Design a protein around this ligand. Structure first.
Ligand code: NAP
Ligand code: 393
Length: 316
């Protein structure tokens, strides 16, 4: 299958990218180096992951080694929640650009719909544990994102963790300048996202699937949470194809016309995870994997459930 998907800005986005959340700076430079060597051309970043400097060190090295040119790369980052005020957006983007040593991003996302109180702390809480919101709204933050395209800092803008009504809010904004190009959402066999994918695709919004392996390294995991990589049913599908469970989990979203961004810092796994363009999951495989949906979320904070823009009260 084709390695890139067409966005609404006329640019092509690689359908397989490298995730970088929880890649420590002490290891992410080597990860990105290896990824580029083995063919990754999309890297998913964020300011909150606090490793964009080291990601940037890799891109620059590989540019200087003559391994890749900038136009071939597709670099994504995201505006953190403490920067939703219209006056903070450009500076947040420019900090990401400076850390990554880039002059533009291919795609810049509103990381979460929830604005948090501005300040140094990424998750400001009150005395008992709820996040402290900011008096920001989706539409004004979107307008600020649009300005970044009009100044040449970013080629495309999109959203992440937006429910369909939040997406609709942007689509229906009077005076909209740019439609979101992408909605990046959690998606895997335990959270198959049928209704939100159908919605987004029916708008020409491309969907990126995050945590496709179930984020086993997420820092809030409980031993009794369900584990995709160890699910014997998925292992059986992998065995039949002489592939790993991770390779099945990466191929799955690709066959749904999604982009997918598995994370690893392990060189062997980085290479493994890219070797998914040479087999196909059957109709039965696809149906079986979709049947495993449990509406189970890696990423959803309790602490954000009272925010006016918390995305996950809506069904989709
Ligand atoms: N927009 C958002 O709100 C949002 C939220 C979550 C995630 N994301 C993005 O999506 C990316 C991917 O999601 P994620 O990091 O949550 O988790 P993930 O990609 O589902 O899983 C990563 C974990 O799987 C392990 N792993 C990777 N390949 C493997 C393989 N072949 N065999 C066995 N284990 C393997 C990794 O270990 P090692 O690294 O130790 O090899 C790591 O512990 C993130 O890094 C981030 O870029 C975005
Ligand atoms: O968000 C990501 O990309 C991955 O998750 C991260 C990463 C970092 Cl470095 C720190 C914390 C998180 C995290 O708790 N994200 C979840 C989250 C955040 C904001 C709002 C919500 N919410 O539910 O409204 C949820």
């Amino acid at each position: 299958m084709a390695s890139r998907i067409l966005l609404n800005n006329g640019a092509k986005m690689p359908i397989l990218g490298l995730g970088t959340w929880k890649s420590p700076p002490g290891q992410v430079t080597e990860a990105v180096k290896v990824a580029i060597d083995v063919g990754y051309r999309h890297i998913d970043c964020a300011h909150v992951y606090q490793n964009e400097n080291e990601v940037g060190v890799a891109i620059q090295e590989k540019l200087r080694e003559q391994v890749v040119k900038r136009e071939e790369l597709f670099i994504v980052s995201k505006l953190w929640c403490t920067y939703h005020e219209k006056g903070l957006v450009k500076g947040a983007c420019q900090k990401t650009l400076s850390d990554l040593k880039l002059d533009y991003l291919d795609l810049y996302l509103i990381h979460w719909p929830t604005g948090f109180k501005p300040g140094k702390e990424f998750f400001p809480l009150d005395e008992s544990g709820n996040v402290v919101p900011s008096d920001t709204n989706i539409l004004d933050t979107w307008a600020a994102m649009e300005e970044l395209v009009d100044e040449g800092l970013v080629k495309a803008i999109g959203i992440s963790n937006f429910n369909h009504l939040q997406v609709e809010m942007i689509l229906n904004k009077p005076g909209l300048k740019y439609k979101p190009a992408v909605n990046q959402i959690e998606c895997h066999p335990y959270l198959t996202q049928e209704k939100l994918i159908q919605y987004c695709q029916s708008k020409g919004i491309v969907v990126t699937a995050y945590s496709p392996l179930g984020s086993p390294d997420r820092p809030w995991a409980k031993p009794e949470d369900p584990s995709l990589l160890e699910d014997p049913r998925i292992k059986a599908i992998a065995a039949k194809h002489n592939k790993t469970t991770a390779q099945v989990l990466i191929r799955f979203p690709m066959q749904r016309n999604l982009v997918v961004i598995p994370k690893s810092v392990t060189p062997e796994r980085i290479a493994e995870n890219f070797k998914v363009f040479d087999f196909e999951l059957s109709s039965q495989d696809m149906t079986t994997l979709l049947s495993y949906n449990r509406n189970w979320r890696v990423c959803a904070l309790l602490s954000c459930t009272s925010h006016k823009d918390y995305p996950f009260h809506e069904e989709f």
